[PDB]
Design a protein around this ligand. Sequence first.
Ligand SMILES: NC(=O)C1=CN([C@@H]2O[C@H](COP(=O)(O)OP(=O)(O)OC[C@H]3O[C@@H](n4cnc5c(N)ncnc54)[C@H](OP(=O)(O)O)[C@@H]3O)[C@@H](O)[C@H]2O)C=CC1
Ligand SMILES: NC(=O)C1=CN([C@@H]2O[C@H](COP(=O)(O)OP(=O)(O)OC[C@H]3O[C@@H](n4cnc5c(N)ncnc54)[C@H](OP(=O)(O)O)[C@@H]3O)[C@@H](O)[C@H]2O)C=CC1
Ligand SMILES: CC(=O)Nc1ccc(-c2nc(N)nc(N)c2CCC2CC2)cc1
Ligand SMILES: CC(=O)Nc1ccc(-c2nc(N)nc(N)c2CCC2CC2)cc1
Ligand SMILES: [Co+2]
Lengths: 159, 159
Amino acid sequence: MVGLIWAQATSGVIGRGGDIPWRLPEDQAHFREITMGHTIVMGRRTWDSLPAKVRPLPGRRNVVLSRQADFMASGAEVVGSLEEALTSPETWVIGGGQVYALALPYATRCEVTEVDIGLPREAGDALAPVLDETWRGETGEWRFSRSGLRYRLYSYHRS
Amino acid sequence: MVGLIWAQATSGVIGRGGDIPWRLPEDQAHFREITMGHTIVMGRRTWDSLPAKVRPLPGRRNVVLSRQADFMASGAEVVGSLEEALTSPETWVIGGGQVYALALPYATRCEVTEVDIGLPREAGDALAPVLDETWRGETGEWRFSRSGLRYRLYSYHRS
Ligand SMILES: NC(=O)C1=CN([C@@H]2O[C@H](COP(=O)(O)OP(=O)(O)OC[C@H]3O[C@@H](n4cnc5c(N)ncnc54)[C@H](OP(=O)(O)O)[C@@H]3O)[C@@H](O)[C@H]2O)C=CC1
Ligand SMILES: NC(=O)C1=CN([C@@H]2O[C@H](COP(=O)(O)OP(=O)(O)OC[C@H]3O[C@@H](n4cnc5c(N)ncnc54)[C@H](OP(=O)(O)O)[C@@H]3O)[C@@H](O)[C@H]2O)C=CC1
Ligand SMILES: CC(=O)Nc1ccc(-c2nc(N)nc(N)c2CCC2CC2)cc1
Ligand SMILES: CC(=O)Nc1ccc(-c2nc(N)nc(N)c2CCC2CC2)cc1
Ligand SMILES: [Co+2]
């Protein structure tokens, strides 16, 4: 099974320069709640974005998506295929932009935080998936982060 | 995964006299979208309340949690355990008021429609269970039904 979770600016950006152009403790607990205990899959670059000092994320089955037998994610599992990770019952695709579009076929749910930040689409930006006609959800209430940036939450299901 | 799904009055009422005292098509397409494909678990009263012309719910593993050995539900399994209904990887307890409180201990997700209705809790109503402190979630924003009614959804999570 697959879920996709990501935090995006309005413009669609999920990463820039290997980090995230914001920080939102409202989004952080949201992300911990949904993924705690479940399987988390991330691309290799996302894994690098995790300081070795919060790696792995605690309480979850950390899976790093790479292509070779020659990469070690230390404290995690390194699988050449997406499908090698989906051995558990809930699997959460936690980025970045590749795995998303790679996992979007297997996916029924997208949990999306939309940060109200005016972030023009720069080249090389990692981007949130392209959710076609099929997906359904509705716009949330613009909620106030202590950060001072509006955010809102989205949930999608498709069948 | 064990989810509990219900639509309730702002007083807590989910059913009364073997029927539902309201009608919300937006709820029905939502209830349908959430359960579609999955094991649905219902009480035997819930199962009866469905006219034949809507039995069983299409595209889902209907499981009826009942008590007669000679009880067969045309288009469903009759289990005694809740867990014998909890076989499935995604499992939705769809009612009713007793089956709910039975399952809540094994629930990781509660998914709630709240109809904005002046409905007293009268003896003989079916009600929604009480979500303990393990539960965390967000209060939806009041949307407007083509029935003409304000409703909002609740998603509650505990792990
Ligand atoms: N805002 C948010 O909500 C999120 C933000 N991010 C941000 O996303 C950014 C980076 O994400 P991105 O840049 O898209 O790179 P990824 O995180 O997607 O990692 C990509 C890597 O995964 C491996 N890979 C990709 N496709 C496959 C495949 N089909 N089979 C096997 N292995 C595969 C390769 O690793 P190798 O090269 O070793 O083969 C590739 O380099 C960071 O800034 C991160 O913080 C992260 C998560 C969500
Ligand atoms: N608004 C909504 O979202 C929904 C509303 N409703 C409403 O709820 C009302 C009825 O619900 P309710 O009255 O609570 O009855 P329930 O629907 O909760 O069904 C009660 C069932 O409990 C079963 N049961 C309980 N424990 C066990 C056990 N350990 N082993 C086996 N069977 C068990 C009984 O089986 P047996 O009977 O075989 O002993 C009985 O069928 C109606 O008005 C209905 O329309 C129902 C579903 C959804
Ligand atoms: C900035 C910080 O310190 N922590 C932090 C960073 C990102 C997220 C997050 N949030 C949402 N909504 N979806 C997601 N897929 C992610 C995950 C991204 C990562 C793989 C590591 C939450 C907290
Ligand atoms: C509106 C209409 O005509 N039918 C209708 C009645 C109820 C529900 C519903 N809704 C939520 N949120 N949870 C639920 N478990 C259920 C139903 C469970 C049962 C069938 C008996 C949806 C549509
Ligand atoms: Co589904």
